[PDB]
Ligand binder design. Structure first.
Ligand code: CLA
Ligand code: CLA
Ligand code: CLA
Ligand code: CLA
Ligand code: CLA
Ligand code: CLA
Ligand code: CLA
Ligand code: CLA
Ligand SMILES: CCCCCCCCCCCCCCCC(=O)OC[C@H](COP(=O)(O)OC[C@@H](O)CO)OC(=O)CCCCCCCCCCCCCCC
Ligand SMILES: CC1=C(C/C=C(\C)CCC[C@H](C)CCC[C@H](C)CCCC(C)C)C(=O)c2ccccc2C1=O
Ligand code: SF4
Ligand code: SF4
Ligand code: SF4
Lengths: 171, 41, 130, 739, 160, 80, 61
């Protein structure tokens, strides 16, 4: 037996079907992640990603910041929370500008078919081309994704701060 | 000893011999008349 | 095992084409071989020819031409290279008039020929603001 | 008409000596430009391009090996002759702890006689840091006459190797089938060379070194010690020191090997008198090594129906993840000298570094642990040799890939599958290098900026955020507990570096537990990062030596070429040679950091003096733990502080070290002219110089041309390495000899 | 005197330097035994140091405030043995070297294989030319007069 | 894309055409030299600027000249 | 000029400009650069010969 084969029977792609790229564990694990989980609107994907990211982002800032405390301090928790929230704001700014400069679409998975059927004799790159058919690959989709990331980041950072305070106080 | 003498006539061997001789007479002048800062005359 | 029966018996390498040769352009080289000779891919390692029609896809014209130059060592001459745009827009590239560029063929006009040597080039100061 | 050799293949003539460049097809026509001169030396040993036959290349390589061994024998003979005639070895024998080893006196010219230092023992000369005195003492050499006879034997051996090379190139050259008997070669090199050398050295130790050194440690002066041959003819001179020779060889042949525990011990630790390893332990070690290697030599099938075939072993090691596995590797390693050179050089450099570590870790010679200059010099030299040899192994792997690699013969084997996913390897190695560098160095920079900002509690220090190397401390604990628990027949740990007591000889520390703290964590991760980046450069050179996305036909340009052109945005240094050039730079960086870590850590936390009441005072005073965690600390408390002896050496016997310090700085800066500039400027300047020469009718017929791009890079890297290594050499030697 | 310097024969700091060097050498000499070669070498060092200092003192050498001989190279013949005479000696030797090199280049430049005779020197012709360089000042001002020293327009020039 | 010019010093030795890695140069009929052929550059859009063409030129100061200009994914040799 | 004649190169963009070479052959056809000149000094590319026009070579007396 051989556990490495050309990806999708194409020996010319710059890719391989290894026990890591195309394993059933990899398939299921990546399909349960918010970025690829089926049945999620882009706002929901952004909200979940932001929640998880703020939740694990408050950690390093609170623990190793400039205002640490070997005991529990409200000032240390506030400093870590503010740093995490501002980092989420910076990431949201990056997401917003990236989406602004990347896509020009409001409804995908159709425009591609329209220009593959009804011809696309225009300036292209909006009618024709169009990389990716996901709802995240639109101006509207990425805007809602960034909004969800930002709101979920705030909520997750607050939740993680509350959990840290409870763990440090009642344990 | 016709090609050996031609080998000794090559640039590296001749340069090594000439520089060895040159360093030799310089070192021996500086041994027999050491610490010469100015012209002896 | 492979998508097409005419593909060389290559096991796939992480040196093939990327997302560029799906939305900008891809290059395909075709050739017919008498023997299933073992040759080295321009991208990765060793592949096996088919005793017949062989078709390979690459991301650059230079990769296809390097493969073709390797094919000449196998006494293979009928190799032809095409450019494919994002849709099936096939354009024959290398044997442009059916004759290799090194051999003179009638019907070719000189492109980029100057009727003087290098010393006849105009002075740059006279080529300012044009 | 032998079946292994060809008789009189090449005539012994001086005709080709007078025709420079006769070996090369291109250089044979004669020089037309000065590039021919440089090409003559760059292709001298490239036997692959001089002949199209593997047999001729193999014969040339065999004779070149003989010439190299003759050179090595001449060097050893010179060392022994200097020990015999221009050394204070006899005086050092009677006072090893107070006399500095010197074996080179300097002639009194141009005032250079100041270099003859006060090494002690009514002697003037240059202090020797190669440890030959300790090695000779461990050999039982107690007189300078023995050194003279060893030098004479070395001269005879060097002549013998020269004659062997001449004989095997011109009178009886072996055939290709003889060279390709890798099974027979491995059997012989493992049994005969290694095992029988270990056995012969064990015999010498047992019969000469064991009694003579035991008498020396007992206080017997070298003059009243019996001559070494008397320990063999008289079974009573050795049976008094080791009362087990009275039974003869009967315990050996009767399997009663327990009787020989008198001189075949397993003690560990160090000799309290000399500070080195117990020579009984050394003899037992060499005996065991001899038996193991002799046994290992009976593995491969050579001429009988017995043993292994390396082809059958390799071809059976396939797997689901590796396709054809090792099929074809036997053909690769029996038809390509470059692949063998790659493997041998890489493992040889790694072995040299391992030797360097085990040397200071467990000092194997009497009175060598307390000779700090010798220990520092031996470690640094062996680590440098190891790094150079590893870079050479990578270079020759790349050369094999460019030249001797056959795609057809390596279908779906390990080599093919590695090339097929070279991107993944190189990208992940890139990520690892960035991660390691970011972390190690940025922790250093974070410490530096926290200290500069007056925030001492925010550092990555022991009294701050602490990164304890718990894994290494666990191993240290395991070794110090090994005697009696896991090595029940050991009396002491292998090395006191893992833990134990402070071993001092003559109030000077020989070995002591090397504590590992947060400072060692950072420097060890720096070592890992530098090693990973060097591996990245060399592996990128080897894997992308044949083709790439930039140049799909890079193998057609050869191993050594400057570029493919200014196109593709610029294709400088895409060769594989230009990767052995950058890898040489990074190896210099890594080895420099390694030797700096060794020097500072040893001086600060191992070496020093022990007071009569047991108080340990080190050379620097333990500043490594708290001041080696910032770059400013390395600059000030190590470089600036320990460079005091080099800069203040003028007028003293160490002034040569200051002169070499300055000259190495000059050479290192000189290298940057070749490294930073380009060929076109120098060619156009040579144009005007040639105009002046033509104006004065003195233009040479051999047209002067600027050094080629590849040669410019080679000159730059050679000068850079020479300058940096010489600067560190002078700094280390002056510092460790002064204090 | 010249430039505010004073003769080294009357420079106190010069004698202090000599005394300190001799004292250091004697202190080094004290730690060896009898007529052993180390003591002989150190005594030779002391003797050479004294001889060098005495010769520098009686050499029309000007010493500064540091007690070291300063060279007066403005051109005056009074201190002519410091720069001017060595300058003449070097000019003679270097002109000899350059002249013999140029003569060899021009001589083997008119043979069938000029480039071969540059890596493999014609030692007979080389020896013939080298011992003829003692007249290089005269040979140079006999070839410049005849126009054989300088090329005129066969020399190559770049495009601009 | 880079600019490639051919000059009438061309001797039609074809070494430039058979050295081009991207099939930019070709040999076309001519009457200015013994070989009756001159190099042409009709596919400069594929020119990468490697200058292998003028490394194989035997004429004194070249008959094919490559002038680097605007960059393109083809001229930059980008497989991605 | 003819075979074996000595000429001076007048082409400015030449490695042998202002230098003297030996004419190998002067082509009698209608080529643009008929004069073939061989030189003793190789150029930067290693070649020692080149084709020159009739107005780019000047015969030495
Ligand atoms: C090649 C240049 C050269 C020249 C011109 C001389 C010239 C001289 N050497 Mg000499 N020598 C040289 C190289 C040279 N040496 C070398 C390379 C060595 C070996 C290191 C020696 C070793 C040497 C010794 C051992 C002696 C001389 C001596 C002498 C002198 C008498 C002969 C004379 C001034 C002798 C002398 O004057 O000493 C009293 C003497 O005993 N030489
Ligand atoms: C390039 C500049 C330069 C100059 C002008 C000098 C000049 C001098 N150096 Mg010096 N030196 C230099 C560079 C220079 N050096 C360098 C780079 C180094 C480092 C390697 C040294 C190392 C050095 C040492 C170690 C010593 C000198 C000494 C000397 C002096 C004695 C020269 C001698 O032997 O004459 C006698 C020899 C000749 C005149 C040779 C020519 C004789 C020929 C055969 C005549 C034949 C034709 C009639 C002289 C003042 C020595 C001294 O006494 O200093 C005061 C001394 O001990 N130098
Ligand atoms: C291969 C290693 C090696 C090296 C690096 C040296 C290096 C040296 N040897 Mg040496 N030597 C060697 C092998 C070596 N030797 C061997 C194998 C022998 C036995 C024949 C000797 C026998 C020997 C003697 C007898 C002497 C030296 C001396 C010297 C020193 C001065 C050399 C000199 O000026 O010669 C110049 C050589 C030439 C100009 C020839 C060209 C120098 C440090 C001399 C020394 O230290 O004086 C105190 C000295 O007297 N050596
Ligand atoms: C006097 C004895 C002698 C003579 C006349 C010859 C003659 C010849 N040998 Mg030979 N050889 C000899 C001894 C001799 N050999 C010995 C002792 C060995 C063993 C090392 C060899 C190994 C050998 C090989 C492997 C080859 C020759 C070749 C040749 C031929 C060309 C040699 C040439 O141009 O390079 C002359 C080169 C030198 C003079 C350089 C000497 C290099 C030394 C060893 C370096 C030592 C420097 C030292 C390390 C210090 C460095 C700083 C020629 C017929 C070549 C041949 O026939 O193939 C075409 C060839 O490939 N020889
Ligand atoms: C027990 C037998 C034996 C021994 C001891 C050796 C020992 C050695 N071989 Mg060797 N070899 C052997 C059998 C043996 N071989 C066989 C059977 C083959 C055929 C497959 C080869 C093929 C072979 C090649 C192709 C090469 C070696 C090389 C070497 C040297 C490696 C360098 C080294 O480690 O330095 C250690 C050095 C020493 C310890 C110095 C003393 C060694 C002396 C010279 C004894 C050599 C033993 C010799 C075989 C006896 C033959 C004498 C003759 C009259 C018949 C080393 C001297 C390499 C080398 O350096 O070439 C010269 C090399 O390139 N060998
Ligand atoms: C067992 C060791 C070994 C052996 C047998 C070889 C053998 C070979 N190597 Mg190699 N190499 C080695 C180690 C080795 N190397 C190491 C350790 C490195 C890493 C630096 C390299 C890096 C390397 C490169 C990058 C290249 C080779 C090449 C070659 C081939 C031609 C060599 C040649 O003609 O050089 C002839 C010898 C010289 C030109 C000598 C040059 C002088 C050196 C550079 C300076 C030494 C200075 C010295 C230390 C003294 C300085 C002191 C100062 C005060 C004066 C040949 C097969 C070349 C090739 O084409 O392979 C096919 C090539 O491109 N090697
Ligand atoms: C001090 C000079 C210096 C520095 C910092 C580096 C740094 C590096 N070299 Mg190197 N290099 C140098 C000199 C240096 N080199 C020289 C002289 C040569 C000539 C031979 C080379 C040749 C060379 C090669 C051939 C290769 C490298 C590689 C690398 C990288 C290894 C990965 C890594 O650690 O990245 C992490 C970055 C650092 C450790 C730099 C400091 C970063 C700080 C500490 C943390 C981040 C700071 C933060 C972002 C600042 C933000 C604020 C700012 C915006 C204001 C790294 C960028 C390899 C590579 O490409 O990477 C894999 C590689 O293949 N180098
Ligand atoms: C021996 C013949 C010779 C002669 C007559 C000259 C003459 C001249 N050179 Mg020159 N040069 C020579 C050899 C020679 N060079 C060599 C071998 C090199 C290579 C290192 C150079 C490199 C060189 C440069 C880089 C420059 C000159 C310049 C000059 C001019 C000014 C003088 C000067 O700066 O000296 C320069 C001298 C040196 C740098 C050292 C030369 C090295 C040795 C001493 C000469 C070789 C001796 C030779 C082996 C003797 C063999 C003859 C024998 C077989 C009979 C002058 C026209 C300069 C110029 O153009 O100014 C107008 C200038 O910039 N030359
Ligand atoms: C370490 C992992 C390891 O060596 O497991 C070993 C694993 C098993 O491979 P094979 O069973 O095919 O090897 C059988 C023969 O090739 C023996 O070498 O090798 C790989 O898959 C290489 C992947 C490296 C991935 C780096 C992480
Ligand atoms: C200076 C320089 C040159 C010109 C250098 C030349 C022509 C070397 C000249 C070497 C002379 C002719 C011989 C060596 C003379 C030394 C005194 C000998 C070495 C010293 C010994 C002790 C080893 C280049 O050709 C070059 C090429 C590419 C990048 C950078 C550069 C570069 O920087
Ligand atoms: S010359 Fe220097 S820059 Fe120009 S191509 Fe060759 S390497 Fe790249
Ligand atoms: S650069 Fe020179 S070689 Fe590369 S393509 Fe354009 S012309 Fe052909
Ligand atoms: S390079 Fe110059 S000579 Fe060679 S073919 Fe192209 S044009 Fe003719």
């Amino acid at each position: 037996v051989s556990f490495i084969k050309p990806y999708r029977q194409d020996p010319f792609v710059g890719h391989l079907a290894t026990p890591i790229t195309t394993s059933a564990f990899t398939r299921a694990y990546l399909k349960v992640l918010p970025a690829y989980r089926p049945g999620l609107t882009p706002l929901s994907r952004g909200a979940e990603i932001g929640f998880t990211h703020g939740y694990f982002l408050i950690g390093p800032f609170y623990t190793y910041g400039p205002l640490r405390s070997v005991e529990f301090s409200l000032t240390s928790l506030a400093a870590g929370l503010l740093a995490a929230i501002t980092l989420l704001l910076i990431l949201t700014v990056g997401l917003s500008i990236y989406g602004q400069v990347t896509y020009d679409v409001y409804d995908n998975a159709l425009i591609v078919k329209l220009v593959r059927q009804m011809v696309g004799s225009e300036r292209t790159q909006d009618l024709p081309q169009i990389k990716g058919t996901s709802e995240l690959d639109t101006v509207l989709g990425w805007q809602k994704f960034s909004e969800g990331f930002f709101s979920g980041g705030l909520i997750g950072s607050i939740v993680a701060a509350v959990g840290i305070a409870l763990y440090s106080t009642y344990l | 000893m016709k090609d050996f003498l031609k080998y000794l006539s090559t640039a590296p061997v001749l340069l090594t011999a000439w520089l060895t001789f040159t360093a030799g007479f310089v070192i021996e002048i500086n041994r027999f008349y050491p610490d010469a800062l100015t012209f002896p005359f | 095992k492979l998508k097409q029966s005419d593909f060389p018996k290559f096991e796939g390498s992480t040196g093939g084409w990327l997302s560029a040769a799906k939305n900008e352009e891809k290059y395909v080289i075709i050739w017919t071989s008498k023997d299933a000779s073992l040759f080295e891919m321009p991208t990765g390692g060793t592949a096996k020819m088919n005793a017949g029609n062989n078709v390979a896809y690459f991301a650059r014209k230079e990769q296809c031409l390097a493969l073709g130059s390797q094919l000449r060592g196998f006494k293979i001459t009928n190799y032809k290279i095409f450019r494919i745009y994002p849709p099936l827009d096939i354009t024959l590239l290398h044997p442009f008039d059916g004759v290799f560029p090194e051999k003179v063929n009638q019907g070719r006009s000189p492109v980029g020929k100057r009727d003087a040597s290098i010393g006849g080039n105009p002075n740059p100061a006279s080529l300012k603001f044009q | 008409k032998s079946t292994i050799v060809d008789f009189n293949p090449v005539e012994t003539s001086f005709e080709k000596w007078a025709k420079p460049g006769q070996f090369s097809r291109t250089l044979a026509k004669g020089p037309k430009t000065t590039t021919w001169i440089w090409n003559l030396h760059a292709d001298a040993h490239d036997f692959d391009i001089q002949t199209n036959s593997l047999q001729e290349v193999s014969r040339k390589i065999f004779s070149a090996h003989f010439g190299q061994l003759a050179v090595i024998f001449l060097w050893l003979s010179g060392m022994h002759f200097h020990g015999a005639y221009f050394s204070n070895y006899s005086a050092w024998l009677t006072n090893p702890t107070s006399t500095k080893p010197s074996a080179q006196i300097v002639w009194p010219i141009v005032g250079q006689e100041v270099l003859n230092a006060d090494v002690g023992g009514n002697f003037q000369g240059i202090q020797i840091t190669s440890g030959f005195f300790q090695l000779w003492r461990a050999e039982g050499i107690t007189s300078e006459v023995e050194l003279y006879w060893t030098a004479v034997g070395g001269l005879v051996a060097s002549f013998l190797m020269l004659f062997a090379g001449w004989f095997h190139y011109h009178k009886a050259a072996p055939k290709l089938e003889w060279f390709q008997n890798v099974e027979s070669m491995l059997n012989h090199h493992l049994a005969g060379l290694l095992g029988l050398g270990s056995l012969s050295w064990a015999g010498h130790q047992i019969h000469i070194a064991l009694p003579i050194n035991k008498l020396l440690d007992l206080g017997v002066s070298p003059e009243e010690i019996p001559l070494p041959y008397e320990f063999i003819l008289n079974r009573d001179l050795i049976a008094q020191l080791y009362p087990s020779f009275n039974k003869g060889l009967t315990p050996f042949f009767t399997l009663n090997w327990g009787e020989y525990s008198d001189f075949l011990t397993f003690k560990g630790g160090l000799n309290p008198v000399t500070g080195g390893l117990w020579l009984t332990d050394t003899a037992h070690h060499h005996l065991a090594i001899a038996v193991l290697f002799i046994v290992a030599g009976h593995m491969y099938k050579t001429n009988w129906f017995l043993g292994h075939s390396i082809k059958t072993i390799l071809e059976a090691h396939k797997g689901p993840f590796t396709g054809e596995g090792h099929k074809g590797l036997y053909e690769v390693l029996t038809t390509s000298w470059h692949a063998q050179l790659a493997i041998n050089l890489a493992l040889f450099g790694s072995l040299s570094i391992i030797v360097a570590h085990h040397m200071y870790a467990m000092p194997p010679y009497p009175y060598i642990a307390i000779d700090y200059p010798t220990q520092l010099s031996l470690f640094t030299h062996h680590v440098w040799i190891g790094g150079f040899c590893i870079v050479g192994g990578a270079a020759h792997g790349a050369i094999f890939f460019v030249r001797d690699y056959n795609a057809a013969n390596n279908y779906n084997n390990l080599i093919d599958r590695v090339i097929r996913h070279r991107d993944a390897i190189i990208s992940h190695l890139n990520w690892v290098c960035i991660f390691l560098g970011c972390h190690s160095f940025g922790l250093y920079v974070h410490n530096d900026t926290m200290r500069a900002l007056g925030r001492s509690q925010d550092l990555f220090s022991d009294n701050a955020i602490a990164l304890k190397p718990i894994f290494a401390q666990f191993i240290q604990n395991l070794h110090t507990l090994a005697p009696g628990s896991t090595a029940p027949n050991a009396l002491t740990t292998v090395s006191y570096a893992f833990g134990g007591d402070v071993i001092s000889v003559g109030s000077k520390i020989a070995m002591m537990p090397i504590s590992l703290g947060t400072a060692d964590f950072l420097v060890h991760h720096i070592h890992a990062f530098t090693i990973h980046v060097t591996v990245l450069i060399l592996l990128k050179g080897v894997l992308y030596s044949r083709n790439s996305r930039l140049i799909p036909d890079k193998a057609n340009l050869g191993f050594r070429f400057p570029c493919d052109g200014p196109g593709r945005g610029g294709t400088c240094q895409v060769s594989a040679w230009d990767h052995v050039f950058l890898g040489l730079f990074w190896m210099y960086n890594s080895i420099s950091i390694v030797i700096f870590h060794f020097s500072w850590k040893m001086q600060s936390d191992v070496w020093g003096t022990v007071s009569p009441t047991g108080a340990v005072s080190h050379i620097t005073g333990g500043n490594f733990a708290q001041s080696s965690i910032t770059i400013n600390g390395w600059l000030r408390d190590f470089l600036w502080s320990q460079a005091a002896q080099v800069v203040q050496s003028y007028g003293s016997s160490l002034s040569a070290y200051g002169l070499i310090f300055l000259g190495a700085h000059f050479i290192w800066a000189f290298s940057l002219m070749f490294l930073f500039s380009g060929r076109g400027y120098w060619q156009e300047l040579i144009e005007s110089i040639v105009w002046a020469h033509n104006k004065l009718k003195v233009a040479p017929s051999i047209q002067p041309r600027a050094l080629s791009i590849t040669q410019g890079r080679a000159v730059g890297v050679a000068h850079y390495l020479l300058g940096g290594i010489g600067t560190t050499w002078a700094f280390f030697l002056a510092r460790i000899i002064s204090v | 005197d010249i430039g505010g310097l004073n003769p080294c024969k009357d420079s106190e700091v010069f004698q202090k330097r000599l005394a300190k060097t001799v004292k250091k050498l004697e202190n080094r000499l004290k730690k060896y035994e009898e007529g052993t070669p180390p003591q002989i070498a150190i005594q030779q060092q002391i003797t050479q140091t004294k001889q060098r200092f005495t010769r520098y003192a009686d050499s029309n050498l000007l010493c500064g405030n540091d007690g070291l001989p300063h060279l007066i190279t403005d051109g005056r013949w009074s201190h002519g043995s410091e720069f001017l005479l060595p300058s003449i000696l070097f000019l003679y030797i270097s002109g000899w070297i350059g002249w013999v090199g140029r003569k060899y280049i021009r001589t083997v430049g008119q043979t069938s294989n000029p480039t071969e005779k540059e890596i493999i020197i014609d030692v007979p012709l080389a020896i013939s030319i080298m011992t003829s360089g003692f007249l290089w000042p005269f040979a140079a001002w006999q070839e410049f007069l005849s126009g054989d020293l300088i090329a005129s327009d066969e020399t190559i020039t770049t495009s601009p | 894309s880079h600019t490639v010019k051919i000059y009438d010093t061309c001797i039609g030795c074809t070494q430039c055409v058979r050295a081009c890695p991207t099939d930019v140069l070709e040999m076309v009929p001519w009457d200015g030299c013994k070989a009756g052929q001159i190099a042409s550059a009709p596919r400069t859009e594929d020119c990468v600027g490697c200058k292998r063409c003028e490394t194989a030129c035997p004429t004194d100061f070249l008959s094919v000249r490559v002038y680097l200009g605007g960059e393109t994914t083809r001229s930059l040799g980008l497989a991605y | 000029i003819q075979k074996g004649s000595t000429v001076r190169i007048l082409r400015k963009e030449s490695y042998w400009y202002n230098e003297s070479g030996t004419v190998v052959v002067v082509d009698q056809s209608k080529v643009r650069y008929p004069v073939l000149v061989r030189f003793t000094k190789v150029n930067y590319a290693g070649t020692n010969t080149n084709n020159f026009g009739l107005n780019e070579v000047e015969e030495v007396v």
